[PDB]
Short mmCIF file of C-alpha atoms in Angstrom, two decimals:
data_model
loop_
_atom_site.label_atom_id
_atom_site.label_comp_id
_atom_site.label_asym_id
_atom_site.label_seq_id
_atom_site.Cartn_x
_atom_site.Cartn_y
_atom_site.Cartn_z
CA UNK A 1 101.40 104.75 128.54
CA UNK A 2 99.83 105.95 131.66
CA UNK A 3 98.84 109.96 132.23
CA UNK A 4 97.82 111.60 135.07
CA UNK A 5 94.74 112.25 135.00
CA UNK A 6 93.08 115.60 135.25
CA UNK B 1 80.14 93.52 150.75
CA UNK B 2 81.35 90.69 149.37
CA UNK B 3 84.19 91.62 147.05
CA UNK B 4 86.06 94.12 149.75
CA UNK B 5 87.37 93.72 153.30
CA UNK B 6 86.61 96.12 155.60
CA UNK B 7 90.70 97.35 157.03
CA UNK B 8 92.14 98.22 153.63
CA UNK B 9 95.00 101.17 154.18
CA UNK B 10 97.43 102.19 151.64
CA UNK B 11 99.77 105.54 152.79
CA UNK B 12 99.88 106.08 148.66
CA UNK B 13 96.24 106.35 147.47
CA UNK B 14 96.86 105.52 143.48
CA UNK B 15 94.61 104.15 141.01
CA UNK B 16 95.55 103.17 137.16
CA UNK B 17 92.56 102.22 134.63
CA UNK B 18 93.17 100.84 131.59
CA UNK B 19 91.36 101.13 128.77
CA UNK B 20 91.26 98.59 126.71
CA UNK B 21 89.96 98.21 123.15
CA UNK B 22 89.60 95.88 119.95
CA UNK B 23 88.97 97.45 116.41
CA UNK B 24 87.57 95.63 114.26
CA UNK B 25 87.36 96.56 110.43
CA UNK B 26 86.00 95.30 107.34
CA UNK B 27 86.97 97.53 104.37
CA UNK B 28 85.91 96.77 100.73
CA UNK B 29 88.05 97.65 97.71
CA UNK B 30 86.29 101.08 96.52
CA UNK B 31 86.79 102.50 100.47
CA UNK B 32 83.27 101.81 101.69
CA UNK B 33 83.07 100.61 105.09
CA UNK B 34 81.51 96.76 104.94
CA UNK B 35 81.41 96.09 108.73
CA UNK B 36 83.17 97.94 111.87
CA UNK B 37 82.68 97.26 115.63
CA UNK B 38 84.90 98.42 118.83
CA UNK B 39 84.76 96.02 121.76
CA UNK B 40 86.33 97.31 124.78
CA UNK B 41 86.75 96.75 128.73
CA UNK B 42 87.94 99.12 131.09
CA UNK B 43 90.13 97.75 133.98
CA UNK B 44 90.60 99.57 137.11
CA UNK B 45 93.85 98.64 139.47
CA UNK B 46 93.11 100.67 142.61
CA UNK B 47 95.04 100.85 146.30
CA UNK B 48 92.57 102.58 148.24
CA UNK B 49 92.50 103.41 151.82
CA UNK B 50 89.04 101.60 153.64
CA UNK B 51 85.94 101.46 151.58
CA UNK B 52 86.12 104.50 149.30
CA UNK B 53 82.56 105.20 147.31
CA UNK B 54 84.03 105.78 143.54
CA UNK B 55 82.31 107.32 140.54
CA UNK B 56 83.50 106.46 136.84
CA UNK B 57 82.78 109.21 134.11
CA UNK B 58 83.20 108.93 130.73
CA UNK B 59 82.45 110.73 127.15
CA UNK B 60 79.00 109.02 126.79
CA UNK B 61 75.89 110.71 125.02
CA UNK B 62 84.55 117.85 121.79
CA UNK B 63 83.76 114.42 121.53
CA UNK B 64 81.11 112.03 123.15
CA UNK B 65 80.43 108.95 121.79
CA UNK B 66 77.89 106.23 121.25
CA UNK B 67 77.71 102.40 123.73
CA UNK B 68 75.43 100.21 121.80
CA UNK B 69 75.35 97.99 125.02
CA UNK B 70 77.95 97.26 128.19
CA UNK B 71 77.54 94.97 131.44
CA UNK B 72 79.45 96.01 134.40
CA UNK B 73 81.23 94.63 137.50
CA UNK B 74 78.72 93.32 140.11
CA UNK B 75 80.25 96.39 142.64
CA UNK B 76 78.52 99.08 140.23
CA UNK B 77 75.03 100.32 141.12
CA UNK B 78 73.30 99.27 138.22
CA UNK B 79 69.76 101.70 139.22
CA UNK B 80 72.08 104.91 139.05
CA UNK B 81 73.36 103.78 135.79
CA UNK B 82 69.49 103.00 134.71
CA UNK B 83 68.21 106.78 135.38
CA UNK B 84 71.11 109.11 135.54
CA UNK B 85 73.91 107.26 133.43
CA UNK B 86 76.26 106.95 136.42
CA UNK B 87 78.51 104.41 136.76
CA UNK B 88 78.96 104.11 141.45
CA UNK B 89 80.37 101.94 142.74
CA UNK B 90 82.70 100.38 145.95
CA UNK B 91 85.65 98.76 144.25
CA UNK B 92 87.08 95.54 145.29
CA UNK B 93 91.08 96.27 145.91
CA UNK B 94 93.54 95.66 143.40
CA UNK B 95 92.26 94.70 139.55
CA UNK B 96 89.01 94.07 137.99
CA UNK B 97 87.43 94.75 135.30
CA UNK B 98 84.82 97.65 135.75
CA UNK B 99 83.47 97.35 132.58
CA UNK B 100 82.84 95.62 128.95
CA UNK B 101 81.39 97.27 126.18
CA UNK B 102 80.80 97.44 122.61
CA UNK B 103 80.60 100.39 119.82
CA UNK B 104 79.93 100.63 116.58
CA UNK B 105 79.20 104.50 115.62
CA UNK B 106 82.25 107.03 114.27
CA UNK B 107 84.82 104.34 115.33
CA UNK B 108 88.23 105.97 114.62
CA UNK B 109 89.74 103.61 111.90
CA UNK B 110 93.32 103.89 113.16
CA UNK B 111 94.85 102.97 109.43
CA UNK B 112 93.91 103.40 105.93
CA UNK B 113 95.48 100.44 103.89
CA UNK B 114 95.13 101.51 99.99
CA UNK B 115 96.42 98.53 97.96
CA UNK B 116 97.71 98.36 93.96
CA UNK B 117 98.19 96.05 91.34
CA UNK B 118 99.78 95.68 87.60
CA UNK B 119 99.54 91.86 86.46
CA UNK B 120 102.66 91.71 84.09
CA UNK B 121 101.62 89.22 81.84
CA UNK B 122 102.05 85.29 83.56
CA UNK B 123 105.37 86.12 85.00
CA UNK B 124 104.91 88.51 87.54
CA UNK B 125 103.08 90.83 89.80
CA UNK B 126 104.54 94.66 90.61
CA UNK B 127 102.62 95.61 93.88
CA UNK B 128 102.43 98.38 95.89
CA UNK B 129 100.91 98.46 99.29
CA UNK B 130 100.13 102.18 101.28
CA UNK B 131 99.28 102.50 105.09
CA UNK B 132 98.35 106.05 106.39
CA UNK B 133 97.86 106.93 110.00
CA UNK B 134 94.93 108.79 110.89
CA UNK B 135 95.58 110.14 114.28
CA UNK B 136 96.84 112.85 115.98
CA UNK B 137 100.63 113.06 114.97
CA UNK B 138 101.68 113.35 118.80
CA UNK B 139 100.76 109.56 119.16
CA UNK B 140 102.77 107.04 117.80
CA UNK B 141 101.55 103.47 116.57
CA UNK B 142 103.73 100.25 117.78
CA UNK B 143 103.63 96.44 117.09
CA UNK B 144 102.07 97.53 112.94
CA UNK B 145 102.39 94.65 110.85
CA UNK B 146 101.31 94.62 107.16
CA UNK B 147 99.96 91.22 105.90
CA UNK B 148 99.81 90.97 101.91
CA UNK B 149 98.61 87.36 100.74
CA UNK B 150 100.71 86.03 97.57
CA UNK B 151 99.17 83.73 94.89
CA UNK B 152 99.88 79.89 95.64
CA UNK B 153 101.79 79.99 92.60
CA UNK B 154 104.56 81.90 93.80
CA UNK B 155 107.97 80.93 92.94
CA UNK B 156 109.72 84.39 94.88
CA UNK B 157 108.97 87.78 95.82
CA UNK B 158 111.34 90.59 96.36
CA UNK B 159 110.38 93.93 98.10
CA UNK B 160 111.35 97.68 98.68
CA UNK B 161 110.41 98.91 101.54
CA UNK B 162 112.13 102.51 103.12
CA UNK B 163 110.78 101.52 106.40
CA UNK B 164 110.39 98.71 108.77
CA UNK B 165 111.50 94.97 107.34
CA UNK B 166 109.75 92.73 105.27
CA UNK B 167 109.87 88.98 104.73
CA UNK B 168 108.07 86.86 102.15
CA UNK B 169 106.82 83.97 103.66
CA UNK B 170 106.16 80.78 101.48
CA UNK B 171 104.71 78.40 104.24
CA UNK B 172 102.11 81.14 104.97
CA UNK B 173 101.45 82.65 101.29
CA UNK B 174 102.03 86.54 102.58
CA UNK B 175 104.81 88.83 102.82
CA UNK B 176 104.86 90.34 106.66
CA UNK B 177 106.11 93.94 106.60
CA UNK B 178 106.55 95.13 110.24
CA UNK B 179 107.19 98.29 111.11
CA UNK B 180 108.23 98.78 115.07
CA UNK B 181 106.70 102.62 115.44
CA UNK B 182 104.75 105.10 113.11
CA UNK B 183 103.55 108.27 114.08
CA UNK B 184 99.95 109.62 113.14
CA UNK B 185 98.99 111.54 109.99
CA UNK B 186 101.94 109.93 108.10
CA UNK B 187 102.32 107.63 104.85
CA UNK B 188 104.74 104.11 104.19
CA UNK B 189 104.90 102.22 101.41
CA UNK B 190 106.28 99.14 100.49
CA UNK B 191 106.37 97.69 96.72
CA UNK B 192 106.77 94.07 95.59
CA UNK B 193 106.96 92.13 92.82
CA UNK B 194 105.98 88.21 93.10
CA UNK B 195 107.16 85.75 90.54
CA UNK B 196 104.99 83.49 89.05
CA UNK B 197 104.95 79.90 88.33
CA UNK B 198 102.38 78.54 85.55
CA UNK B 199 99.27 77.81 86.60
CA UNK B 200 95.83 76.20 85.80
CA UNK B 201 94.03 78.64 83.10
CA UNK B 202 91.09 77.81 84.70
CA UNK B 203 91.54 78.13 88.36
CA UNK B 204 91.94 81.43 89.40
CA UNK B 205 93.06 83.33 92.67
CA UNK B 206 90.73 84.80 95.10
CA UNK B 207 92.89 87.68 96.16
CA UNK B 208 92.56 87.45 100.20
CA UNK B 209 92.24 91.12 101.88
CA UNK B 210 95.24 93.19 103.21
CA UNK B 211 95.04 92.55 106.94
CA UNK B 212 96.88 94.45 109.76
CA UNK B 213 97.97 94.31 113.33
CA UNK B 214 98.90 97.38 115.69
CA UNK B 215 98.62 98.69 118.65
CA UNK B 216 97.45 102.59 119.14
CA UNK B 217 97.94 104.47 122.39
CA UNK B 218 94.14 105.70 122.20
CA UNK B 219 90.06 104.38 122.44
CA UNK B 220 89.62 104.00 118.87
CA UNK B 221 85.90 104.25 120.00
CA UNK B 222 86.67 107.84 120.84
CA UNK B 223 85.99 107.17 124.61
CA UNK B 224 87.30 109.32 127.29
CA UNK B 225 87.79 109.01 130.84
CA UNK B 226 86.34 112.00 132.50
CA UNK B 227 87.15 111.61 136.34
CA UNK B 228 87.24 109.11 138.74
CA UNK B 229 85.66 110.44 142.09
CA UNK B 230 86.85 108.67 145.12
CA UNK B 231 85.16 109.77 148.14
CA UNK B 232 85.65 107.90 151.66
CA UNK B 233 83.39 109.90 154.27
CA UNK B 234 84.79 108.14 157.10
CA UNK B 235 88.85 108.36 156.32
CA UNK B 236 90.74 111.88 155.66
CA UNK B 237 92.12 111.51 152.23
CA UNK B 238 90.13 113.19 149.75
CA UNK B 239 89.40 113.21 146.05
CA UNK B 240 92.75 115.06 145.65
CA UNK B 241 94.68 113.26 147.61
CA UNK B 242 93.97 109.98 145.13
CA UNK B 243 97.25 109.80 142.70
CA UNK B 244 95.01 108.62 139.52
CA UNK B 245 96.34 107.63 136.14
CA UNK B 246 94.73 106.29 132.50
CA UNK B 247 95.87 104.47 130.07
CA UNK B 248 94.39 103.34 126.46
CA UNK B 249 95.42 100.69 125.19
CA UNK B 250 93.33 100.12 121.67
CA UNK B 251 94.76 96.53 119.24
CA UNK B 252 93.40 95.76 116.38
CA UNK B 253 91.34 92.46 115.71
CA UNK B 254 90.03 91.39 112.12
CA UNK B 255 91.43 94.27 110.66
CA UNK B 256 90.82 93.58 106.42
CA UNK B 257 90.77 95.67 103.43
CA UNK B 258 89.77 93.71 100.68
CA UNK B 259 91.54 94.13 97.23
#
């Protein structure tokens, strides 16, 4: 799924 | 520019890119891999305020891994990618695709299909089929789906299987085991046993390879996203104030292990 990204 | 009008606003700045990528394995009966190739694309679904210069940055040569060859987007600035390795660009609102590309160096092989056999005389074969999961146990595999080809002369099969269901399927000449999720650096089995009808001494079976369909929630080229730098020099959002997200989405294509 979607990850926030850094 | 072409591919972007000029009075864009958004009062959420958010961009999504997908990663997107096909595994493709060839596997022969002793282990050894025959043939493997990743091909991927990476989307990008941004709402960006104006005309926002961007800057895509990968793993490319921890963990950094190997493109054989890509083509991009017409928006990406092709001479920084040709002496620096940096993929610029302005990017048209809403979807495209940034990127394809292909790999086929230390490709993750998501699963590890080791097959077995025991011909009981004419009457019968007693089959078991294993799948591991060789990723990191956090991650869960969906959509698996175990393919296992049956001689023509099949009069029935019946299975065991603790998890997931399994059908034999007579028009097709395979049972289908499915199996909805699976978590990495596990082990399922299923066993069979398919009755035989008799048969023409002469011709014989080609056993067709174990093939296999999933979906993985990683690159299974090993690529990762680094950052996405937006930078609009004329608006006052910055970097930080983009909302960014990734996701990988990696299916498997031809995906055989031969027996």
């Amino acid at each position: 799924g979607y990850m926030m990204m850094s | 520019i072409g591919w972007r009008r000029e009075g864009i606003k958004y009062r959420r700045n958010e961009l999504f890119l997908d990663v997107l990528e096909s595994v493709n394995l060839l596997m022969s009966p002793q282990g050894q891999v025959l043939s493997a190739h990743v091909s991927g694309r990476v989307v990008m679904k941004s709402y960006l305020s104006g005309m926002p210069e961007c800057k895509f940055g990968m793993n490319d040569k921890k963990q950094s891994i190997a493109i054989d060859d890509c083509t991009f987007h017409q928006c990406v600035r092709l001479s920084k990618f040709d002496s620096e390795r940096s993929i610029s660009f302005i990017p048209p609102d809403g979807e495209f695709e940034l990127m394809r590309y292909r790999t086929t160096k230390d490709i993750i092989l998501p699963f590890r299909v080791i097959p077995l056999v025991r011909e009981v005389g004419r009457t019968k074969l007693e089959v078991k089929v294993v799948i591991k999961s060789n990723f990191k146990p956090s991650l869960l595999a969906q959509k698996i789906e175990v393919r296992i080809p049956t001689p023509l002369n099949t009069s029935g099969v019946q299975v065991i299987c603790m998890k997931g269901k399994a059908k034999y399927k007579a028009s097709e000449n395979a049972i289908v085991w499915k199996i909805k999720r699976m978590a990495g650096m596990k082990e399922s089995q299923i066993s069979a046993e398919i009755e035989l009808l008799p048969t023409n001494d002469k011709k014989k079976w080609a056993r067709p390879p174990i093939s296999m369909n999933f979906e993985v929630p990683f690159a299974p080229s090993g690529l990762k996203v680094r950052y996405l730098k937006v930078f609009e020099p004329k608006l006052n959002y910055s970097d930080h104030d983009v909302i960014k997200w990734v996701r990988y989405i990696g299916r498997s294509g031809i995906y055989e292990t031969r027996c």
